[PDB]
């Protein structure tokens, strides 16, 4: 990986002198503008495609291993604020996880001694960015600042209208929610945070604001204790169509463009994103699948797709896709897997039409109707006859006299019938067409093929032919299948 360190061969030497002009001993108050000598360098070296990340922290580390950081704390004592505006933007880009702890140790009060000064728009960006990445350190620093006004300023800056300021505000609240555990998520809506997020999610100007605001509200929706507090805020109704509206391909296009989101994230921030896939709320699953598909598209342009294996995110994707009743979430999961190059699982269903008497007896042992395995053996039922049992055979010759036992049997039979494998007998693939209407409808497909019909010949049925031949008893199901069939009228 020579290239990686050859970029350090282009980068690192500029610091030989660039550390010395801020280490310049004499200085002037006009000469403080020198701070910029680094700033171009760290932006430049940040945005090198596919090598950027590796050299970024590898350039930023020099100021803490050897001493540079101290100055940025010792120079904030200047009374006039051009210097603070100029140097907190440098302090932004150098703030990596190995550099957050040096400020977390000492530098806590240093930060909040200017976060109270909310009126300068030119400074409020930097204020918001430092407060954004300071949430990544730990639970304790989050609690110590939320005891301070460290949430009040970003909660107040939702009133403001500057765009990059609102970008940093949405990411600061997302990092606070995602790394603050469960104690601070009650302090958030206790300080009425979930209601001030609506102007950000209702923005019609920048898509990034919308996505990060939906991330923050979906992470606060996982807190059961405050769930109906956040459900009256009004933003959850914007979470479902938005992910339906946007696609993550154009989102990856718009995420490699901007500077601070160009390269992408790291493994620490993304292992904390996988638990949104299995969570209870639909919106948590849909937004987790959105990002982790967009993020796969981001880092598939480079050769770094091997990060999703070790973080334990392709197993969750691979088990979330099969047996899932959510077309949107499964679509995003399949796009992520087929983008990463892995195979997409298909369920393994029992082949009921080819069953014989031994398997029918074993299934009767399974469902708890073991008292009848003799009678079903005397009449010799197999899979094909089990799929075509009606009430009179159960009532007369199989011996089921109690009507409740027939109800408690058919419940189990129709639960088996939706999860069968008719591929050995379904030519035109009628089962998937029936499942796309409603997953409960898949159970009828053997009744449509035992008579013989298929998707090409489906358009010439009558309701009276569905009722007496195909075994559909519920009138709602007949009506819905008719109105889905008629719509394609002499279509082909």
């Amino acid at each position: 990986g020579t290239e990686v360190q050859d970029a350090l061969e282009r980068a690192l030497p500029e610091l030989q002198q660039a550390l010395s002009a801020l280490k310049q001993a004499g200085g002037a108050r006009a000469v403080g503008a020198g701070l910029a000598e680094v700033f171009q360098l760290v932006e430049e070296a940040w945005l090198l495609p596919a090598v950027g990340r590796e050299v970024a922290q590898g350039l930023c580390d020099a100021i803490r291993l050897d001493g540079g950081l101290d100055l940025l704390l010792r120079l904030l004592q200047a009374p006039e604020l051009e210097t603070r505006v100029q140097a907190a933007r440098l302090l932004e880009q150098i703030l990596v996880a190995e550099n957050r702890d040096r400020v977390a140790r000492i530098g806590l009060g240093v930060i909040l001694n200017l976060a109270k000064e909310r009126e300068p728009v030119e400074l409020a960006r930097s204020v918001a960015g430092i407060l954004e990445h300071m949430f990544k350190h730990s639970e304790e620093t989050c609690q110590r600042l939320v005891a301070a006004g460290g949430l009040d300023a970003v909660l107040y800056w939702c009133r403001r209208t500057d765009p990059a300021l609102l970008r940093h505000c949405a990411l600061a609240l997302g990092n606070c929610a995602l790394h603050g555990g469960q104690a601070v998520q009650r302090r958030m809506v206790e300080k009425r945070a979930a209601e001030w997020l609506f102007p950000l999610a209702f923005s019609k100007e920048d898509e990034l604001l919308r996505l990060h605001a939906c991330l923050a509200v979906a992470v606060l929706a996982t807190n059961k204790e405050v769930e109906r507090e956040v459900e009256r805020s009004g933003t959850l109704a914007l979470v479902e169509p938005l992910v339906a509206s946007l696609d993550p391909g154009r989102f990856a296009r718009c995420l490699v463009d901007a500077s601070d989101t160009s390269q992408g994230r790291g493994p620490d921030d993304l292992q904390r994103l996988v638990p949104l896939l299995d969570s209870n709320r639909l919106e948590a699953q849909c937004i987790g699948a959105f990002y982790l598909c967009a993020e796969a598209a981001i880092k598939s342009l480079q050769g770094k797709t091997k990060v999703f294996s070790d973080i334990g995110a392709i197993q969750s994707l691979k088990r979330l896709v099969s047996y899932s009743t959510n077309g949107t979430k499964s679509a995003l999961a399949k796009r992520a897997l087929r983008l990463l190059g892995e195979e997409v699982p298909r369920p393994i269903l029992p082949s009921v039409p080819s069953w014989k008497e031994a398997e029918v007896q074993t299934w009767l042992q399974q469902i708890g109707f073991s008292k009848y395995c003799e009678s079903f053996r005397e009449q010799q039922v197999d899979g094909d006859l089990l799929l075509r049992l009606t009430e009179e055979e159960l009532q007369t010759d199989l011996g089921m006299k109690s009507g409740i036992t027939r109800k408690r049997f058919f419940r189990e039979l129709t639960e088996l019938k939706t999860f069968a494998n008719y591929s050995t007998c379904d030519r035109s693939n009628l089962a998937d067409w029936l499942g796309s209407l409603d997953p409960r409808f898949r159970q009828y497909t053997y009744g449509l093929v035992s008579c013989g019909l298929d998707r090409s010949l489906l358009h010439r049925v009558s309701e009276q032919q569905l009722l007496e031949d195909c075994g559909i008893h519920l009138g709602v199901h007949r009506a819905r299948i008719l109105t889905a069939a008629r719509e394609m009228l002499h279509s082909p």
Partner: nanobody
Amino acid sequence: MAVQLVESGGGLVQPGGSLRLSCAASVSISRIYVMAWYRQAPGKQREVVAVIRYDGTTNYPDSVKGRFTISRDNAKNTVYLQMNSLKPEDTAVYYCNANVETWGQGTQVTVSS
């Protein structure tokens, strides 16, 4: 496809003792609809001991409520059956069953002094 299963465990336990069983499958367990275990006491016919379904719902016969627990482990491909309090009449050969057709070879379990 063909799903072949192997199961390990068993042997002898004192009455009022505990055992754990495994069942390794040739494919992923999260992929396959239903698994179950069966008890075949010598001289009688087979019966169910536990079933487990893809979402995680479990079902047991009334004779073994609380005395057995079945779980799915997805990191390594096994399903587990846990025996905790044992009776002398609970001796048999035990079978794993994937879906309703695939069988296993069974393991011997006896309980005495």
